[PDB]
Amino acid sequence: GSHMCDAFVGTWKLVSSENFDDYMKELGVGFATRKVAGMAKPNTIISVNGDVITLKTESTFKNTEISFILGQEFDEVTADDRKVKSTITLDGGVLVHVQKWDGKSTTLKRKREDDKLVLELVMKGVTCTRVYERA
Numbered sequence: 001g002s003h004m005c006d007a008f009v010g011t012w013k014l015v016s017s018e019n020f021d022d023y024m025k026e027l028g029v030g031f032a033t034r035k036v037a038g039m040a041k042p043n044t045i046i047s048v049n050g051d052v053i054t055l056k057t058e059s060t061f062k063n064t065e066i067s068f069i070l071g072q073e074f075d076e077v078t079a080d081d082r083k084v085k086s087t088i089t090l091d092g093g094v095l096v097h098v099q100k101w102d103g104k105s106t107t108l109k110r111k112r113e114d115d116k117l118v119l120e121l122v123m124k125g126v127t128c129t130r131v132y133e134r135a
């Protein structure tokens with residue numbers, strides 16, 4: 001059967017970025033790591049096996065990999081080495097990824113728009129948009 005996650009499965013590559021440095025400053029990321037991470041052009045591979053979704057990111061900055069079930073909280077080590085409690089849910093056809101640590105929170109939304117996968121990262125008043133195309 002078909003699922004709302006179907007539209008996300010596959011391999012994706014970063015094509016544009018807006019406000020990422022501001023977002024990283026909200027996370028408390030330092031000057032040198034902002035420079036290095038901001039240069040990266042990540043590729044992401046999204047796949048599904050039964051109820052388990054896997055989101056694997058490979059880049060010249062860091063490589064990350066999470067596997068999860070919608071709605072079930074998990075431990076995640078972010079690219080910038082935060083140790084966070086994460087939950088990913090569907091809100092309609094949008095994957096909503098909330099990361100919580102030290103009393104703080106950031107939300108990452110992934111949506112399909114035209115032939116793109118658009119990742120929005122929000123921390124306090126800062127919104128970053130990261131557009132990916134199929135690789």
Ligand SMILES: O=C1C=C(O)CCN1Cc1ccc(Cl)cc1-c1ccccc1
Pocket residue numbers: 014024027029033037040042057059061062078079080119130
């Ligand atoms: O997974 C992603 C994918 C993006 O397009 C933007 C950011 N991150 C996570 C992330 C958070 C904080 C920091 Cl400092 C860096 C990243 C990042 C950047 C480039 C490659 C991989 C991860």
